Design a protein around this ligand. Structure first.
Ligand SMILES: O=C1N=CCc2c1ccn2Cc1ccc(Cl)c(Cl)c1
Ligand SMILES: O=C1N=CCc2c1ccn2Cc1ccc(Cl)c(Cl)c1
Ligand SMILES: O=C1N=CCc2c1ccn2Cc1ccc(Cl)c(Cl)c1
Ligand SMILES: O=C1N=CCc2c1ccn2Cc1ccc(Cl)c(Cl)c1
Lengths: 446, 464, 446, 461
């Protein structure tokens, strides 16, 4: 498992230049505890971490590795779009130009394709004028693509254009590629930093509590649920099925379910249940209600097909179930909602705009200080550096015993509950309230 | 050729016999002139002739009756029961119409009682009538802040005999039918079953069509909200498409039998390169030719498609359910097949399909639709209390009018491909008539002229 | 008015239409719409006759145009307070000129009429496709705006010097009066210039008009301001929210916002001047059986209240009234909200974006066809041309006997009601409802 | 110099005696668990686990296996006090639904218009909170209970609590409200009555200590950025246009600072932590107008309290009556521009107070989730006999803090920290050479337009 060695961040040799940024900084590496929980009860001596692990904190350094005015920064965006890609491009560019006064900033187009011999022709000049308002729009002005290119070709491009720092904005696959580029550079003894800004709307990066665009995604997911609910509650035995991202984890689905308070069933990859259990939950909902809203992560029920499109398959199976039971559900309506387009393709919330700008600015500070083969992450309210190797070796998933999942279980259908009993206590509370109103009203006359 | 045969007689709206009660909100003595009765607006306000010494004459002989609070009413307010039913697909502002019908009845006319029938015409059947809800001030206070209908909705008819049985049993004097063409045809059948038994009932339609394809009408409620939501869907499709090399966003924008949402959204957004509407059937080959032309000098394309486009395109799912036609899916598949067959010229390509139907129809209305819904509903109550029946309320040439259901359900509204809206769609969308290579040369000259000017002023600013 | 003749509605054309219209599949002669589409007589077998003799010229693309497209220079100026959609009008004028007519050049004059003065003309900007691409996503004007006039002689000097053939004047009544003075100075020197107004009034108080651009957006924002005022007021014991909602000379925004929101208890508009004492009487009546009150006030209300900022003065007078009556209103809270900034400075709704684009496109079509000394307006669902002289001679105001104002009176406090009686009926209706619920609940047990 | 003294004793949260009942919630904690106040190590990485720089441990909030109150005999009371804040209705809803749905408590009472609602007169207005009364209240700004500023007689209030059989009172409000909560707690202890008083902190300014985030703060920053966007549109539309926008910030500038960075459209950001003179402000404006025709100024309501003398008075909540710095700043900017009409021949200054729209909206979805989680854990811990404390969020975890220490210290911007550095990167800097900085600007632009000019020239043929 993970050792302190696994958390040591690579530095390019030498920090020969002063940091030009203004004293309105750090001379040594500071650390934060991976786990800030104590081993023992309160005692007369300072508490000791349950874990041996320390993470390096990200910050502007007093000494830097790259000579600012000779430095070329490169940027590439890869994979599915995510709210705040333009914020990361803008803030990397403006930190480079305004704070370090770097020679040049290059935007490589359509992911790693943009660093291939063919693709490198399309590379764009990122100046102040080119990034002024790009953060008001979803997508990426650079464009994106999936899948790799020859690392040899890509380092050929980097050398040819005199790129000293490449920022890799993308998911697990992109950062694995970043580490391969880093090592091809080291192999030829070229002075290049490769520095990852993690892109995962699902917030399933480890050594991390929050990735950029996640909070925006939850806002949009709740708006999709509000529409699904309006549709479902408008029909007799109405069912709204809404797919909410979640390739390998259910953080968006779980947070949206709790925030909206309108989901009756929440289906996540961490909690695989059968078609039969799902229909049993729907059956229980329809005992006391005329509508049901089902949230489903795209990674749920991958053992339900021969990704399979679980949104379509679930909708089809719910229809088949209700048709086979037309006896008890005489008329019924099942609506499928795929809001994926609207969740990923918007500009960020103001809180994600600030987060994106802070990730990007610290990524420039640390790369200028010779950090390489690492990502910037946010953990316990602090910015840290994590080596790509350990970051891509583990992933984050819902704890089904944790407080978030407990809140999902409190609002969603539970076969264990005495619905009909609970209703009797409900009616007593209501009667108490309307009796009080009845009295005050009777009083008010005369 | 088949022409519609509408005469002035066809536009006369039925009144229940007698207006024996004074209006408690419209006192005859608060008029400034005599004769509180029916005023008219011209169907077509365009003249036959040039300006001359005599007043201009309408190109049409038709006059529409204007909707308004009357000084004399047919129903005795405190003995009056109002019923409401919502039918078919939901539409932004259903709750606004329910709320405003209820509060006009209670607050303005002080009616005895308001009943909400549930899940469309099902709610007036013998079985369904058990579910009927009491609409008081407390039940409707904030319902206009939410999409859908608190009454619920369903498609398709019920036995008119059963439904009039329900209306008689509950003592319903006015039934408001909120729904489309099919719903209002049913309203007229209810009206006639009532007349047959000599029961004193007004049936009054509030038209529900998100597509704005009601005739004798320029605007139906929820349409403007739908266009707002359609433009937000297009903004997301564009962000996705422009982020890919040879990226295509296909977005379906309502439009069952007409393309008003698709056309207005295309022009409002200024981001659609192809706009496919039922009024303008073109072949799969013409569509791919437009995409091909777009990809000559761009790396992305956004395609708007109405659900009623290409019904002559193409011809049970795994669970044994019947598969609907879906031009959105079929178009997306055909665009992929075209790009795959031409991977030579479009080496990598991405096609994304977006169905924002859920978000377009299921939201609360814009403030402008909230006002419109409240005004339609309040005037519908005023006119039904004044004994109007077998008719709908519509908005035409900035005015509220009454139209008999028979006329209203005999004709539908469609884009004029020679009109100004469609011209604006053609100005923004790909045009095969342009010289690809020439047009591009002039583009670059204009750009070069601009950056040359900036380059000069910048050079000036230094040594100054 | 009882006056206004067909002559007053005749729109000036520059002499000659010697060029074909380069747009493709247009009108060969001028078509008309009736000013008043109401009939003189009862329905009869013969086509109805207008109550009015007046006909308005319809706006449309013409087959013959006055200006030679490739020799034509278009100028644009934006004047007075900003209004949602200014950038939409600038963009659509520019792109219609360039993309449809392929005009030589488009000039943006800066900070209103100042921009056409000898000093100001140096700041004039080149409007090409690149300069207007996304400007419609932002509030304000890229050209900038200013109030008040310049020397017409100087301005025509500028127009002649820059070879401007069509000047579009985007502004209110004062701006268009200036446009007509420019037009006549041009005619006097025999310079071939069209001056064509796009009316800018957030208040929608242009005559020969049912809707001006930005009005609908303003009502959306006004309703959002009222929603916040209501939340504040209803949260306090004897809470009062006063919100000022534009309305310099008319109350269309205030009236539509009051009805759309359904949360205003008092609506104060210039058309209905009432005394300080009547206002306090309405508040007094509201506080008989409610603990909160929301007051909408147009900026043009109560200009006979000073021996003036009516928002501040009204708020002060409401506080003085509540303080003098602290006996009956023991603790009380008065909040003033001026949302003017947020109402005028936003981008338009999608419906206003479409309207702006349509006004602007037709304005270019008609100016290219030699229309001058006129504005484009929308009336009875149609686009018309109106001479500036008649357009600036009359203004539009609320009809206090109309359906809109009736809806305002239905929701706002009414002194005409019996306080005591009205309340008794209220309580009976409530008791009826809660008695039914009380029964069904009692039933449901067993 | 003067340092704060916080000890482990100050962080020990009071428990009512006895936990005699099992927790009816189903599929937790059998003893009190802790998190480090400061998770930074004393030493370099070594063979031994790292040791905290601080001796302080905070008690973690959680559902307990043993509870103090017998659920079906328990009455929960709720009161909302002071200025409204996005998410008040979310806290009321979640306290109510946790009480009813999880613990099946006897009864939930909503006291109206703050502490007034627990007075003899006010207690008549108290409302019954059931599932039906709170179903959608979280979709609206304000409080369905209503709010008021300032105190009531503690004797009267405990009279009300005893009369209605209230076992737990939740106090939703600021520093002043929670000081009142402690006074209620002690009046109860004095009479030996079994009551828990448990605070949910309400501060839009996020200036609670032992805390990184209070509810409604993130929503406030969203609304502040919308206000700045409108101010910018107005200012950039005028020749020498100035938008002055006031952004909350009574004693700290977290809203102003985060809004300035999020918007990237503020040229000057004025916060209580950084008092500067009228002359320095006008110097920053002067520098902005050297190479721009517009300026946006953010000002916290607590900035420049040494720019005038106030009345000496106190508002109903017992806070200083502040001078209106928004109006005074706007007036001084106008006076400066008028006195310099020579160099700023026409100028326009607009003042924007968006306070109404910032505090009176429903929460963002992220604030709705936060509010629900604070409220649910507050019920869990009060049922487990926690009293005289608040629930707070720190280092991504929920903790309990005694009111006494929570009301003794407040949180303020670090002018040497990363947030304020980002504010300084975007706002006007007198330290730059105006003339030199401009020359380099133009060179970079010329380089860019030369590249575009080339690619365009290429593209023909
Ligand atoms: O194999 C994986 N599949 C999914 C997710 C995953 C994996 C490894 C790490 N992670 C989490 C992760 C997500 C994004 C980034 Cl940028 C990184 Cl470096 C790791
Ligand atoms: O088949 C149709 N498809 C669309 C529209 C349509 C049809 C028939 C009449 N009409 C027009 C219409 C639409 C709505 C209503 Cl409520 C009415 Cl009465 C007619
Ligand atoms: O003095 C006026 N106050 C308000 C309205 C008004 C006046 C004069 C004409 N009008 C109508 C009007 C409004 C805007 C425009 Cl652009 C025009 Cl041309 C006329
Ligand atoms: O006197 C203060 N003025 C402002 C802020 C402050 C004070 C004391 C503690 N605090 C921080 C604080 C804020 C809110 C709450 Cl609910 C609490 Cl308990 C403390």
């Amino acid at each position: 498992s993970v050792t302190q060695e696994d958390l040591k961040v690579d530095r390019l040799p030498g920090a020969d230049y002063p940091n030009p940024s203004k004293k309105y900084f750090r001379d040594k590496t500071d650390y934060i505890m991976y786990n800030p929980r104590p081993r023992d009860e309160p005692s007369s001596e300072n508490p000791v971490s349950v874990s041996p692990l320390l993470c390096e904190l990200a910050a502007a350094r007093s000494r830097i590795h790259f000579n600012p005015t000779e430095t070329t920064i490169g940027i590439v965006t890869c994979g599915g779009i995510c709210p705040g890609l333009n914020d990361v491009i803008r803030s990397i560019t403006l930190t480079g130009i305004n704070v370090y006064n770097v020679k040049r900033v290059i935007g490589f187009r359509f992911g790693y394709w943009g660093l291939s011999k063919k693709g490198s022709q399309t590379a764009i000049e990122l100046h102040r004028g080119r990034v002024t308002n790009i953060h008001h729009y979803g997508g990426t002005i650079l464009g994106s693509s999936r899948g790799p290119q020859d690392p040899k070709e890509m380092v050929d491009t980097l050398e040819r254009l005199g790129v000293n720092i490449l920022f890799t904005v993308g998911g697990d696959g992109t950062q694995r590629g970043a580490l391969v580029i880093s090592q091809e550079a080291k192999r030829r003894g070229v002075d290049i930093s490769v520095f990852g800004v993690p892109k995962t709307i699902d917030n399933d990066l480890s050594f991390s509590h929050r990735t950029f665009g996640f909070q925006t995604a939850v806002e949009k997911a709740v708006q999709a649920i509000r529409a699904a609910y309006a549709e479902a509650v408008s029909a007799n035995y109405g069912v709204g099925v809404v797919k909410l991202m979640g390739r390998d984890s259910g953080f968006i689905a779980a947070q949206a379910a709790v925030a909206s308070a309108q989901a009756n069933i929440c289906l996540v990859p961490e909690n695989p249940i059968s078609e039969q259990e799902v229909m049993s939950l729907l059956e229980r909902r329809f005992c006391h209600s005329r509508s049901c809203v089902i949230i489903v992560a795209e990674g749920f029920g991958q053992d339900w097909g021969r990704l399979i499109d679980i949104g379509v398959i679930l909708t089809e199976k719910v229809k088949a179930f209700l048709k086979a039971n037309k006896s008890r559900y005489p008329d019924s309506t099942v609506k499928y909602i795929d809001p994926s387009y609207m969740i990923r393709a918007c500009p960020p919330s103001a809180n994600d705009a600030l987060f994106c700008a802070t990730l990007a600015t610290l990524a420039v500070h640390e790369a200028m200080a010779g950090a390489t083969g690492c990502i910037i992450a946010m953990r316990h309210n602090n910015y840290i550096l994590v080596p790509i190797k350990v970051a891509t070796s583990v992933r984050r998933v819902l704890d089904l015993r944790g407080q978030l999942w407990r809140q999902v279980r409190e609002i969603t259908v539970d076969l264990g509950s005495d619905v009909r009993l609970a209703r009797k206590l409900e009616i007593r509370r209501e009667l108490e309230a309307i009796n009080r109103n009845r009295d005050r009203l009777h009083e008010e006359l005369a």
